[PDB]
Structures are given as C-alpha cells and as structure tokens.
C-alpha cells in the first residue's frame, strides 16, 4: 500500500520535474538568446564594414558596441542594466521587419486574387524533447547568421557605390547649372536684393538651415557621425529604392514591343512578366493604401498640435508640444500624433454627415466620398486609374485640411487673443499645465474630458438643438449671400438682380430711403433715373440658370457633361461639343480606360440659380461658417466656465469658510481667485453638463442620476485583466515582504551575532531577498495563470464574475494579511528588520510570538500535504 503511493508520487513528481525543465528551458533558450544572438551578429557585421572596432579588449566591444553616451563598466549590475536595451532594440527590430512583410504579402495576394488583373495582364501580353529544442536551436543561428549577412552585407556594400556615383551626379549637375544660371541672369536680383528691404535675415536663416546638411554630409564621408541610425541606415535605403525602381522599369521596358494583336509564346518570358507585374501592382497599391491610412493622420496630428495644443497647455512662444511630454520613449510620440489626427477626421466626417442629409439639398457635395456609395469598389478602383491623378487628389485634400486646420485655430490661439485682444483666457494657469504622460495633472484632465464626452454623448435633447442652431444660420446666410437655391433648393425671386440707387452717395447713406422710393434693362434704367427723380430703384436679373447633378454619388464620367448654362426651356444656350470631352475622357482615363464599369442608374439634373461671380460667394459662405462655429464654441466654453465659477465661489467658500477656519480652503481659495483670467477644463466640463440640462429643459419649453452608469455599464459591457493583475501583483507583493521579513527573523535567532555575522560576509542582505523576490515571482506567475484560466472559463454575468474575483482575492489577501496582522499586533521588515539592526542594544514576548506563529503556518501546510497525499494514495487504490 505505502510502497504503491510512494511509486506513484515519485512517478508523478519526476514527469512533473521533467516537463517543467523542458518548458522553461525552451522558453528562456528561444527568448533570451535568439535576440541576443542578432545583435552580436548585427555588431560583429557592422564592426567588419567600417574595418575597426571602438574599444581595439574584444567582450566590451559587444555589450555596448557603438553606444554613445554610455561610459563602460564590468560590473555585474552595469551589464545587467545595459543587455535590456539590446533585447528591446532587437525584439522592436524584428516586431517591425516581420509586420512589414506579413503586410506586403497579404497585399500581393489580395491583389492577385482580383478578377481585372487577368483582363489587365491579357491586354499587355496578348492571346497565346531536451534533444529536439537543443537541434531547434543551432538551425535558427544559423538562419539568423545568413539572413542577417545577406540582407545587412549585399545592400551596404553595394549602396556604397551608389551613394559614390549619386554624389558625384549631383555636385556635377550643381556646380554646373546652378552657377551657369546664376552668373547669367542673377545680377539684377541681386541688385534689387541690396537694398529692397531682407537678404540679411533670408541668408541668415539660410545658412543656418545649409550648414546642417553640409554637417550631415561631412558624418557620412568622414566615420565620426556613428551611432545613429540614419547615418547606418542611409546605404540600405538606397540600395532598396534603386531595387524597387529597376524593378519597376524593367517590367515596363519587357512589356514593350507585344500587345493584343502578337502575343507572346515563350513560356520562359511570361512567367517573369507576370512576376514583375503582380510586384509593381503590389508596390502601387501598398503605397496609396499606407499613404491615406497612416501619412495623412501624423500630419493633420501634428499640424493639430502646433495649432491648438500648444498656446493652451504650453507656453505661446514654442512651436510644438507632444515631443516635451513624452522624453521617456521619444518615438512614442508617434502614436500621439495619428490618435489626435484620426479623432479630428472622425469628428469632422460625423459633421459634415449632419450637414449632408438635413439642411443642404443632396448634390451639392459630391467630389466628397459619400458612405453609403452602394457602387463603390475600394481595390478595383485603385488599380484601374495612374497614380499621378490619385497622388493630386490626396495632396489637394492634404492642402485643404491644412487651411482649416492651421488658419482657424492658429488664428484663434495665437494671434487673436495673445496678441489683439491681451488676455490669457486661453492660457492654462501655470500650476496646473501638463509636463509629463505619467502625471496626475495630465491624467486628470484626459479622464474628465473623456467622461464629459460620454455624458454629453449619449444624453439627447442637444442634437436636435445642434440641428436647429445649424439650420438657421444657414438660412441666414444664404438668404444673404444671394446663394439661396444653389445649396439650399427653396428660393424667392427677389434674390436675383440687385439694384442701383439715385446715386452711389445716396445708395450708402440713404439705402433704405432709396428703396421707400417692374423689371426693367440696364439702360431703361439708367433713362428712368436720369429723367425722373422719383425711382430709386430697378430691377436687372443678370442671373443665369444651370444644370447640376441630383445626387452625391453620380458617375464619375458624367460630371464632365454638367454644370452648362440651361434657358428656361430646358434648351442649352450655346452647343457642347463631344470630340473635346471624348479626348479629355480617353486621356484621363489611361491606358486600361475601358476595363472600368460606370453604375449610371442615380443620375439625374436639376434645375437651379446660380449668380453672377460664382468663385467669392461660396468662399465668404466657408469664411462665415468657421465665424459662426468660433462663436458658437468660445461661448460655450466661457458661459460655462463663469456659471461654475459663480456657484462655486458663492456657494460653498462662505459654507467651508463657516464650517473649517480660514487655513483644503487654500486652495480651493487661490483656484477660484486665478479663474477669473485664465481657463479650467473642470470648470467647463461642469458647466458644459449643467447648460445640457438647462438646454434640454428649454428645447422641451421653448438623466439625472442613475442613467449615467447604466449606460456606462454597457459601454464596459479592461477590467478582466487589470482586476487580475493587480490581485496577484497585490498577494505577491505581500508574500515577498513577508518573506523578506520571515527572512530576518533567523537572523535575529541566531544572533541570539555569531552566526548571523559569519553568513553577513558573503552579501547575506541581499541573497535572501533575491531568493524571495524569485520565490514571489514564480508564485505571482502561477496565480496569474489560474486566474487568466479561470476567467478564460467564465467568460448579472458581470457581477457574478466580479463576485468570484473579489473573493479569490479577498480570501488570498486575508490569509497573507493575517500573519502580518498578527506579528502587528503582537509588536504593538518591521519588528524582524528592527531586531536585525538593533546590534547595539519585553522583546522576549514578541520573539517567542514569532516563533510559535511559525510553527503553526508550518504545521498547517504539511497536514495539507498529508492529506492531499492521502487523497492521490485514494485515487491509486481505485486504480489498482
């Protein structure tokens, strides 16, 4: 019986043993070497290139390498601290490399599976165990040693060369033309130059901005610009993009001479047409795709920045403000930027959706993307038309998001309120401006402008106000501006034709009583006004009617045929030719012009107004919309800032002044005392609530409580894993200080420093603690396991999986706590690191607590033991 328990435990035990060995040594061999492998290759290739090794000792050459600003030193720590680096550096460089070709290649197929791509090739061509994880090892160095000596040796070497002939063709042309054109016509600028202002502050600045890339060049030819990752990088990048470009012009020169009519009938030629083909499609398609996608976000995200983020949270004579914050990890701010840029576009299509579909007539909008668009293919599209037609579109895009951006909220403020109207009431004060990411200052204001927005969001009773307020200044202004059919589609005919008075004099002063003073013709008027002085006032429609299109989706190859003066009878003016719109459509089109489908079903005209000098009216009509949209945001903001304010001051100050003597009070004092010159985002995310309630109330004229987390409770319909991490951070933290302190106690024992002297020679302060520390972290490990397997199993429903959490860990948390709770209690590190350091000097109560309250932690765990050993000795009885 003994006997068979005893087997089976020790079977258990050691396969237990075996697979445990197996798993961490896979894990930490893989983990920890492959990456540090790469980088010694990386540095031993590198060091062979420049011919030379910085420290000419060869192991410190390897751990630090080419870092600069890093003085060496052999000491343990010092190389502890500093082979982290390298593991990250290689981790994030092989992250990088393998999404860039995971990437390509879902592209290259995507583009391949299409069903125009072999109409699109047929018209360029024509008709006709300890052993197995040790062997897993040497194989991946050995392709890592390949890979890396290929792709880091081949392009350097030869984009030496290239960057040799690229220099010389570029200093030669220089030298050449721009000294020829400058000896040659250049005189009487430089003339004018000397004395029109200016030439001072341009070259200045010039030479400034010329001397860096004259410093750049001089690192790059002369090796003491090292250590820096462009100057490395320089060779590899051109190497490729020359590659990518010979690939590219050598499809096109291969695919010349062959075309429908002579096919191709060497099987050896076609292979690689289709090869190069399907490549430069792939590089086409990759390039418009990542540009719209991740260009176009960074700059609107920095643009964004410089315009708005910095004169409010920053001071005013900076230029940029992301890069400050983030001086931890610099390339952070790379994902800072696209957040900002994706959230505004966001913001602006959800927008213009809500002007789209209620206050302007539908066709007014079309050069727009519209979302529903049911003939709408994304990738078809794409290869059909060049790519200098869709590289303009994107870049007009760019340029008219770049006015918006920068003209009005730069104007707002940096120039308006700085500078014209002398305040800081968009200046954040300065105790309370952001410095860092991993501030309180920062996370405060990101939390409550995310909770406002949730609150103001999902609450109702705003939209239709929004809808309103916008469809009346819309009125208003196109009412105006003589544009009242053309964006609108209801009109009066008194907005065509404008009138001239007695006299210009008469007109500006006496408007009004000149019209108290029948259409008629320019010239009969002018006979009225000159014979009889009684009409200041005629009637001239000097108007045109159009054609426009009847909907935001019409085919591309229709809107050419629009927009041409109609007369009252639906009869064109004048003629439209059709030779000139079939040239312009056969060579916008391109070469593959017929292999692309129109959906000509929502394609209709309509009949509309449009006045003379139709270029400044629906420009003044953009300049009035932002006057109108400031305006509606700056009141906003400062009628909630002084109704909180308000409340606030005259409010609870005199209670608590009443209540606490004049010394929490402070603050909340010098807080009020400031807002009455600068801006509180608190303060307006109040105000902003409150006039939501008050807003409401009046639109229901003329949610209090508990809707808020009812629906906060679906949005979070994050917790599982943060709830879990922090549980077992929580219980390891207590076990490793109780361990720590548990460590102590035998020192003290043995002191009782005999013993406790002898083992402090050999860094006894520091082993145990170490012992722990790994000891805690195993533990930690292995309760992070259960609990992600638990909750992976449990996956109302929330408060019972809260319920099951909240007890796991409260259960751990109070039996960890109790010793602790106990040693505590008993003594009213701790009590253990007081005795340790007490060398030089009741006690005996506590001391003996110590040792009885470890005798029953130790009892309690070997009669677990005894019985869940007795349980598996159950268990093997059924068996047998």
Known sequence: ?????????????????????????????????????????????????????????????????????????????????????????????????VILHI?????????????????????????????????????????????????????????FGLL?????????????????????????????????????????????????????????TENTMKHSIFIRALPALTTYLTSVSIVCASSNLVSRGYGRENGMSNPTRRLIFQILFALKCTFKVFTLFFIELAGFPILAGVMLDFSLFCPILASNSRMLWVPSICAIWPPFSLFVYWTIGTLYMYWFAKYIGMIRKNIIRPGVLFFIRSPEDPNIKILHDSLIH????????????????????????????????????????????????????????????????????????????????????????????????????????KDTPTERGHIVYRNLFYKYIAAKNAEWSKPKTLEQAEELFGQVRDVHAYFVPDGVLMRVPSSDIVSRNYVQTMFVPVTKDDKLLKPLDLERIKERNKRAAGEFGYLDEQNTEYDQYYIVYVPPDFRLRYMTLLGLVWLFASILMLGVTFISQALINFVCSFGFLPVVKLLLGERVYVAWKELSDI???????????????????????????????????????????????????????????????VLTDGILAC?????????????????????????????????????????????????????????????????????????????????????????????ESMQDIYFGLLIALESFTFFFQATVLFIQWFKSTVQNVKDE
């Open 1 to 97: 019986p003994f006997s068979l328990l005893l087997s089976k435990s020790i079977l258990t035990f050691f396969e237990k043993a075996r697979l445990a060995l197996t798993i961490g040594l896979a894990a930490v061999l893989y983990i920890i070497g492959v990456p540090l492998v790469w980088n010694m290759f990386g540095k031993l290739y590198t060091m062979m290139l420049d011919g030379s090794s910085p420290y000419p000792d060869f192991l410190k050459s390897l751990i630090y390498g080419y870092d600069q600003s890093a003085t060496p030193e052999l000491t343990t720590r010092a190389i502890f601290y500093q082979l982290l680096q390298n593991h990250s550096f290689t981790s994030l460089q092989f992250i990088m490399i």
């Open 103 to 159: 990437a390509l290649y879902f592209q290259y197929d995507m583009i391949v599976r299409e069903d125009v791509f072999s109409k699109m090739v047929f018209h360029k061509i024509g008709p006709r165990k300890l052993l197995n994880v040790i062997a897993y090892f040497i194989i991946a160095v050995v392709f890592t040693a390949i890979y890396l000596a290929i792709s880091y040796l081949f392009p350097t070497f030869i984009g």
């Open 164 to 220: 040799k002939i690229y220099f010389g063709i570029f200093k030669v042309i220089l030298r050449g033309l721009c000294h020829l054109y400058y000896l040659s016509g250049a005189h009487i600028a430089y003339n004018g130059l000397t004395k029109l202002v200016v030439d001072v502050a341009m070259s200045w600045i010039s030479d400034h901005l010329i001397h860096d890339i004259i410093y750049l060049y001089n690192g790059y």
């Open 386 to 489: 060049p790519m200098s037609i869709q590289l303009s579109r994107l870049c007009l895009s760019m340029f008219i998001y770049a006015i918006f951006i920068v003209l009005g909220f730069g104007f707002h403020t940096r120039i308006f309120f700085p500078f014209m109207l002398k305040s800081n009431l968009l200046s954040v004060p300065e105790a309370y401006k952001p410095t860092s990411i991993i501030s309180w200052k920062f996370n405060t204001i990101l939390l409550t402008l995310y909770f406002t927005k949730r609150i103001l969001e999902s609450s109702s009773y705003v939209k239709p106000l929004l809808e309103r307020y916008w469809k009346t200044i819309f009125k208003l202004c196109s009412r105006k501006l003589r544009l009242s059919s053309f964006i609108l589609g």
């Open 675 to 737: 807002s009455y010159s600068y801006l509180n985002i608190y303060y307006v995310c109040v105000g902003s609530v409150c006039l939501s309630k008050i807003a409401k109330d009046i639109l229901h004229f003329t949610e209090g409580q508990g809707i808020f987390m009812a629906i906060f409770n679906s949005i979070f319909d994050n917790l599982m894993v943060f709830i879990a991490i922090m549980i077992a951070v929580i219980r390891t933290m207590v076990s490793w200080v």
């Open 747 to 839: 020192y003290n024992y043995l002191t009782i420093s005999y013993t406790i002297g002898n083992s402090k020679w050999f860094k006894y302060d520091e082993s145990l603690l170490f012992v722990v520390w790994i000891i805690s972290s195993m533990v930690n490990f292995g309760t992070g396991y259960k609990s992600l397997k638990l909750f992976f199993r449990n996956r109302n429903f929330l408060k019972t999986m809260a319920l099951e959490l909240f007890k796991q860990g409260f259960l751990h948390m109070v039996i960890y706590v109790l010793p602790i709770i106990i040693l505590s209690l008993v003594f009213l590190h701790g009590s253990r690191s007081f005795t340790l350091s007490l060398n």
